[PDB]
């Protein structure tokens, strides 16, 4: 139910333009709207490879990509995508009310 880790093969990409909606923004809005504690990101490293991964915790469930990134920032975005994408949520859409 809320134990272990949910995983997806996700590699995040850099922002195409500075005003782009990122998966991290979508995950904050979702947690806000669902009345959940904000996401908690935890960095995992493979220093010999200069590799990074991130585990994101949302509603007591851990989320993580199956892929490592050279960027800590991109690994956090990848963890956010797995969280959204595995739940059927949009990763580039926010509400204007």
What is the stated resolution of the deposited model, in angstroms?
2.2
Residue 64 to residue 14: CA distance in whole angstroms:
18
Residue 28 to residue 34: CA distance in whole angstroms:
10
State both tokens at 28.
Answer: 């904050």
Residue 67 to residue 4: CA distance in whole angstroms:
17
CATH architecture of the region 1-97: 2-Layer Sandwich (3.30)
How many other C-beta atoms lie within 10 A of the C-beta of residue 96?
3
Q: Distance of alpha carbon 3 from its chain centroid, rounded?
A: 17
Write the DSSP string, 30-81: HHHHTT-PPPEEEEEEEGGGTEEEEEEEETTEEEEESS-BS-HHHHHHHHHH
**Which helix H or strand E contains 83, and what residues bound it?**
helix 72-85
25-to-37, 39, 65, 91 alpha-carbon distances in Å: 14, 10, 18, 9
**Which helix H or strand E contains 5, and what residues bound it?**
strand 5-8
Method used for this model?
X-ray
């Amino acid at each position: 139910d809320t134990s272990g880790v949910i995983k997806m093969a996700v590699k995040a990409d850099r922002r195409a333009y500075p005003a782009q909606i990122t998966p991290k923004m979508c995950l904050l809005e979702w947690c806000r709207r669902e009345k959940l504690a904000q996401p908690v990101y935890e960095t995992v490293q493979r220093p010999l490879d200069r590799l990074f991964s991130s585990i994101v915790t949302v509603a007591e469930q851990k989320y993580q990509s199956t892929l490592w990134d050279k960027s800590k920032k991109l690994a956090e975005q990848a963890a956010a995508i797995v969280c959204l994408r595995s739940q059927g949520l949009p990763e580039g859409r926010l509400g204007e009310e």
